[PDB]
Write a protein that binds this DNA or RNA. Structure first.
Lengths: 148, 185, 167, 53, 222, 51
RNA sequence: GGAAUACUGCCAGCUGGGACUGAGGACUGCGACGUAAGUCAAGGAUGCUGGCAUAAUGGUUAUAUGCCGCCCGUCUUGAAACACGGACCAAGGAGUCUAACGUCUAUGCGAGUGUUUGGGUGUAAAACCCAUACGCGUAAUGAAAGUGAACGUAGGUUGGGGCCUCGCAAGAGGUGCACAAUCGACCGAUCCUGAUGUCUUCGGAUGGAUUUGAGUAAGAGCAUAGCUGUUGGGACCCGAAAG
RNA sequence: AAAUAUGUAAGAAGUCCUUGUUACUUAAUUGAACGUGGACAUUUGAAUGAAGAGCUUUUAGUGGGCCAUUUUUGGUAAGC
């Protein structure tokens, strides 16, 4: 709303908050990003280091689907199981009844071992896993079988 | 004339009478503006002062943060007080039987505490239960874990999270950030 | 509405005043005012008249007589700050002034209905004048020129300085 | 001074005489009697101007 | 529970106990003040009769009145005038005379007139212009209870106990002095006695150390 | 609500100082001094009158 | 040799005249005088009396008198300026909207969040309802191939509000969220070290390093709205010589 | 070799006694650093004052200066 602005407050004051010397002008310092290696050099280096130059190797026709690999950490690993059945697998912490968790069906590409799943054996189906992620699943009695 | 040593007509710099128009929150303030005055208990002044806080100054407290605080020696059966929001954590699988007083409970947090035999109560039910904050444990969520705090105090040789929109290669990863391209920060 | 309302109203009960500590005490007249002294009236109908001071009434005023036979000034009361106390004195022994008091001089203030569009004295007030001045005129005779002194008005001549005069 | 304070406080702790370890600024001088026994005051006068060159 | 006379008598009786202590304390101070003066008066005589000279003890207390206004003051003297709480013209404060404080008074000479106050000057200042700094507020004393409630930790029970702590620089001079608000003195009634003020008292002005003549100036301003 | 001056309004003075009644009754403000007969030595007078 | 006076200083010594003020509104307090009753100048003015009851006091307005007062706006170190705009009056006349953003605040939900591309529906541009996706967040670090966050109650120490135990209290002890300093641990990069093994050239366990990251260490974000600030736009309004 | 200006310190994050750790150090349980246990509290380490102390984010205007005492350069001097 315009009625809560400072424009309604500067009515009657000559310079409208811009100063009698400053004399608010069109573009006193340039338009856009003018003078980056120049009269705006200090602001660039202090706040945006790395802005100029090139750093790496190019990639022509990069499709962001060869790199789709959302990562799931072991700390959850159980939000995938519905909460209705989640309880009774914890009490039934036995093999031959181990739940099968397809991570790809949930939309994940890799499993990372952030830590501390419970001690219930569980079947985890995934495309990729980290080395530590599997060691915790195998220690808990479960196994990791790779899918594609 | 007076040689004024300090600034004249300066406000305190602390918030009172919180700027929210929430009528139910003004009622909790009214109840604790009475308790703080007439009970001379430090608890009633901390809670009333915490009722004025803005959203960023009362960050959420997860149930895992409540459970960890009940693992302190002798705090197992203390009433947890959180002026703010109690959120839910799926990262913990066991939650103790405890009573928690908070402004709000998320649906997951309420289920976690209620399912474990505990109870979720409001701050006015705490007042009639512990008028002087008997056997209470005030908990506060993390403040500097916010995203905005990463960019406060940006400068050379600080590692202070440049305010950037797009990341990746060729986005501020160049002269000024490696010795190969000029200098490093 | 034209004006909506005052959402809170003020009470209309008058609060009692606090307990005040202004106690009345008798006035201490200046030492120059001793009954029998001759006074000069500074204001009123009879200003400039030399006149005899008889008594100190209850309402902080002075009971004063001309005498009436001498200069035509009856038994009046005057304010203590509107007179000059002179050195000349006449004895008032044998004059009974215990009768006179505040209620003796009463006006019975007229009602607002009574309007004087275009335009008497009590019988006892005339007789009371003759009783007092009879015992006071005789006391005057022992002092020569006193009757003439009381019969002549006071006035200031060119060069008379009240801050340097003695009365 | 630190180790001198501890020894002073410990030694005076046996009888408690208000040890008074704080330093003090130079206080104004007390009263005294100055005698003229062989010290009769000598009267001095300002000198007149000279050249001395 | 009527409680209109059961507890009223207890407070009224307890009040009498405090008044009795003040009455006997004030009686002893009068005997103490008079004894010291006669002893000093006699000591000067005995030394004269014995052929020697009596050198009095240097004064331990001064009353400092800021004479200069607030504009155009150099920073260092202006800082010192703030540390003596002299933030206004014609404002007074008692100072303990030590080496650490005599150098303070040397830096503000063109701005203050001070000297050695007497019992009469201190008594009339505190009785008339005595205000206590209670809860960061300037409260008129006007009663022994205000002094008792705040200065009672140091054995100061009345307004004469506080005055006794000023004329005699006691163990708790600092606490009693700082408890006093800076005195807000008026302009002198008969004038300053000089055409121009901003010269030394020695040179013919107003500022500097006027040793015992400060009492005449202060009383006119009080 | 109003500051009443001591050194006047004797009631307020008596409230602050219970000794003010004893001080006035005994005329302690005009106390006499016992007469002493000491006389300065010959050196003090000679030095005082020395040219 | 004995006094007086001056001068300076003190009195919780007495007393006369003048001026301005009367704030507050049942009581409470501290005091004073009396054996007591009670009274008082003791936490802010009352008592008596008069004239008038009306333009009398008073408000407004014009005039006169005494003293004072240079023309406003602006650029400027400095304007009444012999600096610029202004003869006068009415009406109009200049920090706005949008896209993307920073800090702060309010609100809902919360490890999630966003119904509105669209579909259903409707009292039809409203309101109400909804699937799959997708955007941002929940993981970082490398140029990349790649790899990818617990030795330990998610660590030790110093403070730390609040709470708990004793204590009449002062204080002592325990536990200590957020937050501050520090020493460690884990993840990624760099430089090393190089085990069991082997398509003998692959693999990379194990352990380090005054190296490095916009990391982890019981998640805080998403969405909408407001003031303020930034950028591109005509961009607060009017103004070139030009091309 | 001054005067005026100028750095540091005047305690609890301290002092003292005993002994624990280490891959540094020492000829050497000798050191160094950090610790455990114990003793010393409002005169706990000069004065004066403290009007609250500490910390953070964000943004405006400004970036033509001039005068006076004192020190001082150029210049005969200057309202330089």
């Amino acid at each position: 709303p315009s009625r809560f602005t400072k424009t309604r407050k500067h009515r009657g004051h000559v310079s409208a908050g811009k100063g009698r010397i400053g004399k608010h002008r069109k573009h006193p310092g340039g338009r856009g990003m003018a003078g980056g290696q120049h009269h705006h050099r200090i602001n660039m280096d202090k706040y945006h280091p790395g802005y100029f130059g090139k750093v790496g190797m190019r990639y022509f026709h990069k499709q962001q689907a060869h790199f789709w690999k959302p990562v799931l950490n072991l700390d959850k690993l159980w939000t995938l199981i519905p909460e209705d059945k989640r309880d009774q697998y914890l009490k039934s912490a036995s093999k031959e009844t181990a739940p099968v968790i397809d991570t790809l069906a949930a939309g994940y590409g890799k499993i990372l071992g952030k830590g501390r799943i419970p001690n219930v054996p569980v079947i985890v189906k995934a495309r990729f896993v980290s080395k530590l992620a599997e060691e915790k699943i195998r220690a808990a009695g479960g196994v990791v079988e790779l899918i594609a | 004339g007076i040689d004024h040593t300090s600034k004249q007509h300066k406000r305190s710099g602390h918030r009172t009478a919180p700027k929210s128009d929430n009528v139910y929150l003004k009622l909790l303030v009214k109840l604790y503006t009475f308790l703080a005055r007439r009970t001379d208990a430090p608890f009633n002044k901390v809670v009333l002062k915490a009722l004025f806080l803005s959203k960023i100054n009362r960050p959420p407290v997860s149930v895992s943060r409540i459970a960890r605080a009940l693992k302190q020696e002798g705090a197992a059966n203390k009433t947890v007080v959180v002026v703010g929001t109690v959120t839910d954590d799926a990262r913990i699988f066991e939650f103790p039987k405890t009573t928690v007083a908070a402004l709000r409970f998320t649906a997951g947090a309420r289920a976690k505490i209620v399912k474990a035999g505990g109870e979720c109560i409001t701050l006015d039910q705490l007042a009639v239960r512990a008028p002087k904050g008997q056997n209470t444990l005030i908990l506060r969520g993390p403040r500097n874990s916010r995203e905005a705090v990463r960019h406060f105090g940006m400068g050379p040789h600080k590692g202070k999270a440049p305010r950037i929109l797009s990341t990746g290669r060729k986005f501020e990863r160049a002269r000024g950030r490696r010795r190969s391209k000029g200098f490093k920060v | 509405t034209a004006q909506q309302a005052p959402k809170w109203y003020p009470s209309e009960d008058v609060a009692a005043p606090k307990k005040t500590r202004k106690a009345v005490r008798p006035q201490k007249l200046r030492a120059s005012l001793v009954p029998g002294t001759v006074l000069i009236l500074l204001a009123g109908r009879f200003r400039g008249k030399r006149v005899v001071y008889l008594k100190h009434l209850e309402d902080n005023t002075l009971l004063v007589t001309g005498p009436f036979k001498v200069n035509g000034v009856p038994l009046r009361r005057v304010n203590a700050r509107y007179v000059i106390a002179t050195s000349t004195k006449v004895s008032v022994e044998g004059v009974n002034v215990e009768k006179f008091n505040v209620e003796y001089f009463a006006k019975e203030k007229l009602t607002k209905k009574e309007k004087k569009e275009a335009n008497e004295i009590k019988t006892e007030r005339v007789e009371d004048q003759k009783v007092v001045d009879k015992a006071l005129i005789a006391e005057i005779k022992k002092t020569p020129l006193l009757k003439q002194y009381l019969s002549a008005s006071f006035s200031l001549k060119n060069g008379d300085k009240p801050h340097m005069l003695k009365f | 001074r630190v180790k001198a304070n501890a020894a002073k406080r410990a030694e005076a702790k046996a009888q408690g005489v208000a040890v008074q370890l704080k330093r003090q600024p130079a206080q104004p001088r007390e009263s005294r009697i100055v005698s003229t026994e062989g010290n009769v005051p000598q009267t001095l006068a300002p000198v007149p101007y000279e050249t001395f060159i | 529970a009527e409680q209109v006379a059961a507890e009223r008598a207890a407070r009224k009786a307890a009040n009498k106990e405090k008044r009795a202590i003040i009455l006997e304390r004030n009686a002893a101070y009068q005997k103490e003040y008079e004894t010291a003066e006669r002893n000093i008066i006699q000591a000067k005589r005995d030394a004269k009769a014995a052929g020697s000279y009596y050198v009095e003890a240097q004064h331990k207390l001064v009353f400092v009145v800021r004479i200069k206004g607030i504009n155009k003051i150099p920073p260092k003297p202006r800082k010192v005038l703030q540390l003596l709480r002299l933030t206004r013209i014609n404002s007074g404060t008692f100072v303990k005379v030590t080496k650490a404080t005599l150098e303070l008074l040397k830096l503000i000479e063109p701005y203050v007139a001070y000297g050695y106050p007497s019992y009469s000057t201190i008594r009339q200042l505190v009785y008339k212009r005595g205000f206590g700094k209670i809860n960061k507020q300037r409260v008129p004393l006007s009663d022994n209870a205000i002094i008792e409630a705040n200065l009672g930790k140091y054995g100061i029970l009345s307004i004469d106990d506080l005055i006794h702590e000023i004329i005699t620089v006691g163990p708790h001079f600092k606490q009693a002095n700082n408890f006093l608000w800076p005195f807000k003195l008026s302009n002198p009634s008969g004038g300053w006695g000089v055409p121009r003020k901003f010269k030394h008292f020695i040179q013919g002005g107003s500022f500097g150390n006027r040793e015992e003549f400060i009492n005449k100036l202060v009383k006119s301003m009080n | 609500v109003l500051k009443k001056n001591p050194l006047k309004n004797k009631q307020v003075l008596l409230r602050l100082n219970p000794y003010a009644k004893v001080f006035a009754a005994e005329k302690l403000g005009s106390k006499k001094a016992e007469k002493t007969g000491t006389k300065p030595a010959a050196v003090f007078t000679e030095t005082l009158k020395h040219d």
